[PDB]
Design a protein around this ligand. Structure first.
Ligand code: ZN
Ligand code: ZN
Lengths: 954, 954
């Protein structure tokens, strides 16, 4: 009795009783699986389509095809032949899109204003119906892909990824190179007279079949309205009845096992990777055997494998569990980072792993463990935070390929039967004879003889000697390991407290003392049993010089290192914390189920106040911290650019260079002395937000205060005697340039900042609307058309109460060239703005309005919004509505005069600074530009300029 | 064979062989005594005339007449009838004048450009020849005198001064009131039909006789040229042959002795004053009996009376010795300040004094002591710093009344015969039966029954009970007192080191390390055996908050308290030091004979590095420091004004209020911990200047460095990681006002500041030339004519590399009235500047030029000049010549446009701040003024304004 285009309708989708969204699953006649989500409150609608095809289906001779195909779909269809019709449509309607390609999936997703779902969905639909694959774009777009590959080339994590593939069965599609590059997608095909367009076409035509598609749509419309919409657009996707690709034979056969790999890293990291090929456990998902094992082997704290490796001083962290491979095969991994001692005892570390493993084989599957994970996952599912539409649809679209419509939401959370046999079955794979081992360290440099061809990774490959293997097999039973004890952080009280009669819409100051200032709001819209607790501890000793900065950091690092064990239970139990040093002191934040927060917070605080440093932990953390600093040189050029601009523009800021040099002066006794000093006088400013009453909030603050007082004899620090850092004020018509060399990458990174003014309602919206207007043309001009690089970013930069327009680019091309093109782009944006209809202009205002008014869907997000106002000392909780009202009054002329005053090459109030990070080895008309003054010493540079006021609060 | 106008010529004046000035003494026929000083290098010439008449010669019914007469002489003579002819002449020729009246002297003095000595001396001469005593001025000027008295009314030191007089013989002229006021000089005389003008005339005519005059003149001209000059102008002063006043009978007879006075102070001070009437010892000056006694009784450190009173915790400081009375009588005094314990043990303190005294009577005069003082004074005289002309002439003119022409310079330094009998004679006066005692404390408030009539001082007068007196008489011998041991700081090496081949004209950076930066110059022009050693120790812990500021202060106070004893010998031996906390850390400076500097510096440094705090000293210093803070409220309104403007204009600055509140949190353990922290990391910047070689300079720096390293394990602090404080940048056309109440005085104090710009050669000279131009009209308009108060000051204000025009006034009238008159004055200065000849304008430029180019005459002064450049981090050692060259290029138009740009009521770049300090109880056309924004919170005020850059160094 259905619409003839619908094979089946699932009207009972299992969801959480907490979830007010309405859900209907469909199975279209053409095979498409569909989850429709009706949310009448949502400000943004969203859709995602997942093609169950990916890079593993690339033709042998055109590796990267499935990825290039992804890129191309954005760039024109027969119905919508404009190359950025899609992206320009989304931009002008508060929307955004993205997509990715893995081995078996290509997932495309967008969100958009709820009033324009049909229009966006319609343009989106055409990708799977009538792409153009325009030869004009094909040549240009290949660059973005190549640039995207070059982005990753020097990234350790992408290097390892690809190298594990090149070390398997060469025959197996697992071995193929996914990303592609100019060579694979252009050069090699041309040498050999192969038309990659005929190929994109043939690919799209053989694999882009309705029977391998899954869709998820979230809108305001009724499930019924949505159903007709989806059928209307998608029911006519051709079903090619292509068989779902399958990979039964494991890419790692015997001649690939019992192998050792010595790898040269880009960063100076010490890492041990231990891998076991396992069968695909996807089918056994309602008992989840690999995670049961992942949970135990990767467990942290008391008795765990990690505690031990930590105590011996070999390893700092550990990750264990199941790793996805592809339909037919998976991996089970144990990865750890190595201390200097660790690197010399790899063979024993591996022995200790097998001992832990042995204990499990002897002990057997534990009913209670599985039952505890089960109980946790269930609470997690029921009280799961409301998701952002874009991430939610994209995720669901992916999940539809693996689970019944009615189980698509609960799958991967809700376990059912315990299956001891399945656990045992996997456990049997975990053996020396089945192991691959990879050591990553610069202590291998110069002494490898192999180059992976896509990344150029340097490595040695050798067989683990039998005497070793056998030692591992003969791994006995270490009485030092032992099973996790019961989780006592498991929440039990989920009662949502009645809203108090006094409850406020925004956080209210309910305590204003010398020692503590306390902002509190009781949750009035999400109603989950969660709280967010944030504390900023202010002390001048935290940032007085590079040495105290180094000392505050190491103090927290060591505190966290000391708490891990105990806190790991809480983390499993959905109760998490973060602790970090700031330029004002320390930042402590607790989030999760409110129930047992007092227990963790009390322990955290008592801990800081009574901290006794272990000498060995100290020396290890400090070594790591040292490497961490040096390691910054291996970071992306664009991240260097953003880093130095930050340091440049703030009154006081210690560089990684200053910190490294002052680090040697840090010693255990000096640090020991430092702690009490740091703790002796403090001011605290807090936001306690969620399922809590005023009464409870104050009780929490008091525990924290009184704890510090009794254990570190803390006394108040008057807020008025706390210095706050100002932003550097650039001169009218000034242009400064700061130049550094990136010693790792062959791309340069540039950040161009045009300082405007102190933040205020008017200035903010001039800036943000101008940004909104150029946001997508920036992408379309500098990346799509000019193809200057994969990383091309424009937008608002805010700090220390000041703001301005920033551009960020990572490019093969040099900084002075980027500059000109950016300036060439600005001229263009001006004219485009003059020649803009009042209608296109109103769209943009409406676009930015929806983006700003789009409310947080969860507590932690709303909490972070509030925390931003507190941290900045602006306390502007109604900022969104006030700022959007002003925004709607702006006209084209407002924006023109703004640009001419602050942004034009010849603007009287142009305040430009550029940060050029040079690659290791270093069209529309661009204007003539002044000669920049070049900064050689950041300190001198700041001394010779004025500083801004601090923003007034509300 | 002399000029007939000269009775005698002394051509052998005893001077120091070091002194290149030429000296001739004359005795004019008319009785005038004269010292002529030829100095061909001097940039400024100078004269002083001392009339051996003062307030003790005031007529009974017009007290203050001799003082009013002084004032009036400045205001017109028959030859030069213009009321400010004199002062305007000096101003326009780089000169200045002042005068004072004591009991027996009226001393008038001026300096002026060396090229205009005759013209100035000529106008000056007329004061003693043909004053006008103009009725128009007489009425106006009385105000200045009254205002001058009101300035002093609330000053404890002037209150006590006058009260000791009102407590003597009422018959004796000593009892008269010196300053005068509107009442004595106008009101009472009018009630009783007495013409004070007939009186000024009669006074001048009976007492202003050549036979009571002494003159001293210092010029470039030859002694012969000077002789003719002096005779020309002064030989015709009428000799009235008036007998020199004499006061043989002591103003304190028996019925005035054995008295006790309980006095109520304005400040909260605890002071004990012990006084003995002695005979006049003026005649015994070449053995100096009262100073021999003054030296011993006032001695500090080992064995001394003070050490003991200190150890018992009663007294913090002590002053003892002879005090001038007037021809015929003197006093011998012992004054101490009291701790809280001290105030309850006054009677025992006094007993301990008499015990020390007893020891002296038993021990008898000590030949070696007198001989040691003798040797010291002789070195002091020989190596005396070259004096500034104005202070030198004024002093000499006074000295001529007491000593042979040929002994006028050496007198009071060079002793001759030891006279044991004279010592004994004075010592006999020092007895309980001859003592007056005065306790000054707020613990007397409300319970006195006497009012001194001139100051209104509140006090009780009672007779020391005989049982007490007798106890003092029965004072035995305390074995705890003991005679000063030999002074080992007595210098012995006076060799002046040859100037090195490399010697530089300005200090040169001869060391530039992480830990120490060292500026050094070898003296190339004074050639005395002296050095100046200045160290600024930089540490952030010194000013991080009010508590650390309080802690750095108390640390130094206690260090100095602990060193006194040991260092007092060095001080006697012309080797002095200063130690004080600064906003950047600590400041240490040593000056004097270079010989034994290393000994003192070594001891000072070792001391800081190894300081062990005594608990009792701590509690006492801290009490004092507490009182010190509160006591600030009793300071002059104009000093409050200058104080709050300073705090207002600097980025960071703790108020006396913040410091008092944070003081309670200071404790011995907290302070003990603070010291090592403070000393652990340091940067040092030093100027070592004088009779020292490069080699020696570096050796001194190294001792200081290595001392700290070995005793407080100091490590370097990178100069680049040291934050420096910026000045607040006021907005264009802004006007802020900060208002406070002075709770003691009945005058208000105002400081008006017009911020101009960052310092630079051009800006500096615009400012200083404008100041030079208005300097004297300011005085003549606001004080002389408008009579707004005694304190009326205009000039340049410099700080944190910024500058501006400041006006300071203390007035009966309210702040808003002062403001208008000041603004009324500015309009006037503008027109006056437009209507100014190029000739009057060039004079002003030439005036300011001479003032700026006038070189230091001694080492410590040149050293302070250099230190200013270092402390400010401008290092502009040639500043004077460079700035004067620019100054000579300026024109009237330059100054006009400057005024219109920065200073006019409607100037676009007017940056005005005012500080109004309200009295306890609160014509040319003034412009309309804006409504000021009023500052209620200095902190908020600074946060909302930008900050200036720091000046670039050279
Ligand atoms: Zn891509
Ligand atoms: Zn006077």
């Amino acid at each position: 009795m259905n619409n003839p285009a619908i094979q089946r309708i699932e009207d009972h989708i299992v969801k959480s009783p907490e979830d007010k969204r309405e859900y209907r699953g469909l199975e279209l006649a053409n095979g498409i699986k569909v989850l429709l989500i009706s949310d009448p409150t949502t400000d943004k609608s969203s859709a995602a389509l997942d093609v169950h095809i990916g890079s593993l289906s690339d033709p042998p001779n055109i590796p990267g095809l499935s990825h290039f195909c992804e890129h191309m779909l954005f760039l024109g269809t027969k119905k919508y032949p404009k190359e950025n019709e899609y992206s320009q449509f989304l931009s002008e309607h508060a929307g955004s899109s993205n997509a990715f390609t893995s081995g078996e999936h290509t997932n495309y997703y967008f969100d958009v204003s709820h009033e324009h779902l049909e229009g966006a969905l319609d343009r989106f639909a055409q990708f799977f119906l009538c792409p153009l694959f325009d030869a004009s774009c094909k040549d240009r777009e290949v660059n973005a892909v190549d640039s995207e590959h070059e982005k990753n080339v020097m990234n350790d994590a992408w290097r390892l990824f690809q190298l594990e593939k090149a070390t398997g069965n060469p025959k197996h599609p697992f071995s193929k190179f996914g990303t592609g590059n100019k060579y694979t997608l252009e050069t090699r095909p041309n040498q050999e007279g192969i038309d990659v367009r005929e190929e994109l076409l043939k690919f799209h035509s053989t694999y882009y079949s309705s029977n391998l598609m899954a869709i998820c749509v979230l809108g305001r419309e009724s499930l019924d309205d949505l159903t007709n919409l989806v059928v209307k657009l998608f029911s006519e996707v051709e079903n090619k009845n292509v068989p779902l690709p399958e990979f039964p034979e494991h890419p790692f056969q015997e001649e690939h096992l019992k192998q050792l790999y010595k790898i040269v890293p880009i960063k100076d990291i010490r890492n041990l990777y231990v891998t076991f090929p396992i069968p695909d456990l996807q089918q056994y998902y309602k008992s989840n055997p690999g995670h049961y094992l992942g949970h135990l082997i990767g467990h942290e704290g008391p008795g765990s494998l990690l505690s031990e490796l930590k105590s011996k001083g070999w390893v700092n962290t550990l990750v264990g569990g199941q790793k996805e491979g592809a339909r037919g095969f998976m991996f089970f991994i144990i990865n750890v980072d190595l201390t200097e001692e660790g690197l010399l005892h790899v063979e024993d570390i591996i022995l200790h792993m097998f001992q832990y493993i042995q204990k499990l084989r002897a002990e057997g599957p534990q009913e209670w463990v599985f039952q505890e994970c089960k109980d946790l996952n269930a609470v997690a599912f029921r009280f799961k935070d409301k998701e952002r539409p874009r991430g939610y649809t994209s995720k669901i679209a992916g999940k539809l390929h693996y689970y019944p419509l009615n189980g698509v939401l609960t799958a991967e959370y809700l376990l059912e039967e315990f299956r001891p046999d399945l656990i045992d079955m996997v456990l049997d794979k975990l053996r020396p004879e089945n192991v691959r081992v990879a050591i990553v360290s610069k202590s291998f440099e110069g002494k490898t003889d192999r180059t992976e061809q896509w990344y150029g990774t340097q490595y040695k490959q050798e067989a683990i000697p039998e005497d070793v293997i056998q030692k591992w097999q003969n791994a006995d039973l270490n009485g030092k390991f032992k099973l996790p004890t019961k989780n006592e952080f498991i929440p039990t009280n989920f009662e949502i407290l009645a809203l108090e009669k006094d409850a406020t819409p925004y956080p209210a100051l309910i305590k204003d003392t010398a020692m503590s200032k306390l902002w509190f709001k009781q949750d009035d819209k999400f109603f989950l049993p969660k709280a967010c607790l944030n504390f900023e501890f202010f002390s001048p000793f935290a940032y007085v010089d590079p040495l105290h900065c180094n000392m505050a950091y190491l103090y927290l690092e060591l505190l966290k290192d000391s708490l891990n064990e105990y806190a790991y239970a809480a983390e499993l139990a959905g109760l998490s914390y973060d602790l970090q040093n700031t330029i004002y002191g320390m930042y402590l934040s607790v989030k999760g189920y409110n129930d047992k927060q007092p227990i963790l917070l009390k322990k955290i605080t008592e801990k800081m106040a009574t901290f006794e440093i272990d000498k060995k932990r100290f020396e290890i953390i400090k070594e790591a911290y040292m490497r961490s600093l040096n390691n910054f040189r291996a970071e992306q050029p664009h991240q260097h650019a953003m880093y130095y601009l930050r340091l440049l523009m703030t009154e006081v800021a210690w560089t990684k260079d200053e910190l490294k040099e002052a680090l040697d002066d840090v010693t255990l006794p000096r640090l020991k002395a430092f702690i009490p000093q740091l703790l002796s006088r403090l001011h605290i400013e807090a936001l306690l937000h969620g399922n809590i009453t005023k009464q409870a909030a104050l009780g929490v603050m008091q525990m924290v205060e009184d704890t510090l007082i009794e254990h570190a004899h803390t006394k108040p620090l008057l807020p008025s005697q706390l210095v706050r850092y100002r932003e550097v004020q650039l001169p009218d018509r000034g242009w400064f340039v700061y130049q550094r060399r990136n010693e790792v990458h062959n791309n340069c990174g540039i950040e161009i900042y045009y300082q405007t003014d102190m933040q205020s309602t008017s200035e903010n919206m001039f800036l943000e609307l101008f940004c909104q207007i150029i946001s997508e043309p920036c992408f379309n001009t500098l990346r799509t058309k000019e193809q200057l690089g994969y990383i091309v970013f424009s937008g608002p930069r805010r700090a220390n109460g000041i703001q301005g327009l920033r551009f960020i680019i990572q490019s093969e091309k040099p900084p002075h060239y980027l500059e000109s093109r950016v300036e060439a782009f600005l001229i263009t944006m001006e004219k485009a703005i003059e020649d803009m209809t009042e209608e296109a202009f109103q769209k943009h205002i409406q676009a930015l309005a929806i983006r700003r008014l789009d409310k947080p869907k969860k507590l932690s997000a709303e909490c972070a919004k509030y925390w931003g106002e507190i941290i900045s000392q602006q306390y502007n909780y109604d900022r969104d509505n006030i700022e959007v009202a002003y925004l709607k009054t702006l006209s084209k002329d407002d924006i023109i005069k703004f640009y001419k005053e602050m942004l034009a090459v010849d603007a009287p109030r142009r305040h430009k600074v550029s940060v050029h990070v040079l690659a290791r080895e270093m069209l529309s008309e661009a204007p003539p530009l002044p000669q920049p003054e070049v900064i050689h010493n950041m300190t001198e540079f700041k001394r010779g300029l004025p500083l801004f006021p601090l923003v007034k609060p509300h």
